[PDB]
Amino acid sequence: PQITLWKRPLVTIRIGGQLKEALLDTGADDTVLEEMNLPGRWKPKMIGGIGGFIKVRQYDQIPIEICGHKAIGTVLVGPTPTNVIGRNLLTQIGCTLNF
Amino acid sequence: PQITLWKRPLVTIRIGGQLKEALLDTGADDTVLEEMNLPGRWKPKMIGGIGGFIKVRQYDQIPIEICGHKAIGTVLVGPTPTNVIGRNLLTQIGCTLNF
Ligand SMILES: CC(C)(C)NC(=O)[C@@H]1CN(Cc2ccc3c(c2)OCO3)CCN1C[C@@H](O)C[C@@H](Cc1ccccc1)C(=O)N[C@H]1c2ccccc2C[C@H]1O
Numbered sequence: 249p250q251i252t253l254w255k256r257p258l259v260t261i262r263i264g265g266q267l268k269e270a271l272l273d274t275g276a277d278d279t280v281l282e283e284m285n286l287p288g289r290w291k292p293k294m295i296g297g298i299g300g301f302i303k304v305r306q307y308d309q310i311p312i313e314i315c316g317h318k319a320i321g322t323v324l325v326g327p328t329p330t331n332v333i334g335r336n337l338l339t340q341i342g343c344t345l346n347f
Numbered sequence: 348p349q350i351t352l353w354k355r356p357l358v359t360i361r362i363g364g365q366l367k368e369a370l371l372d373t374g375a376d377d378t379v380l381e382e383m384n385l386p387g388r389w390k391p392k393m394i395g396g397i398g399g400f401i402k403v404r405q406y407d408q409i410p411i412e413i414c415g416h417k418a419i420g421t422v423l424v425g426p427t428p429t430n431v432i433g434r435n436l437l438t439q440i441g442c443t444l445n446f
Contacts, residue, residue: 251444253434257373272444273374274356275431280397298379298396298427317446328397332374335352338446345350345371347416347442 249315259315261333263323268331270314274345276334280304280324293324302326317341348414360432361412362422367430369413373444375433378411379403379423394423401425416440 251257257272264286278295290305304326311320314333319340350356356371363385377394389404403425410419413432418439 249446253373253437253442253444256376256434257444271374273372274352274444275370275372275374277355295397296428297398298394298431299401300398302398329395335355339352341446343352343444343446345352345356345373345442346445347348347437347440 259333261315261331262313263310270331270333272338272343273332273334274338276332277336278322278324279332279334279337280326280328281331282325282328284325286310286323286325290325295324302328312337314341358414358432360414360430362409369430369432371437371442372431372433373437375431376435377421377423377433378436379425379427379431379433381424381427381430383424385409385424389424392423394425401427403427411436413440 258269261268261270286307290307293304293306294301304324307323310323319337321336357368360367360369385406389406392403392405393400403423406422409422418436420435
């Protein structure tokens, strides 16, 4: 798909067998989802952005379908305003910026 | 050009006669630049990012050249760890997300 940016670049994702709305975010190094339950062992991690740092749970090697494309990588879960798919997964689906 | 996401999508920009490095961020609604004293009037504003809200100064109709392409729009100035080009400017240079 080719996506314009006049509107937030949101796509549907399926994870843990559940559907969710996520934002394709080229400025995010990692992927972070709102608080939710994921199977598997998690490790406490901290990530920072604008506003400061937050504490999150890191789940490794999680399968996730992003708008029909398949990826398997690290997924962070914590107090974020919205689900964000970062560069770690975006590259897995051959996502690029063009103009 | 086509920008890959293996690394942060950093490009050179020109604003206020100064050259800077800025991140092409599809997840940012607005454009936020590191502290710099631009001439002109501005209005106070609050923007939220991952770690909370930060107070910024909003300047309107600022000419900015992104990787050679010209654009003009609202730019927020404040204590951000990096310069961020949001969708308000990305749509002006015809930037798209592709996969
Ligand atoms: C207009 C601003 C700029 C304030 N927008 C954002 O920060 C939005 C916020 N939403 C959320 C939002 C939505 C709506 C809101 C709100 C916040 O507040 C009020 O309304 C979540 C997505 N971000 C976009 C991020 O792409 C920005 C990016 C900035 C950055 C890059 C590099 C170093 C420091 C800061 C960012 O936060 N990046 C970090 C990042 C992000 C995720 C996972 C790992 C990492 C590390 C790092 O790359």
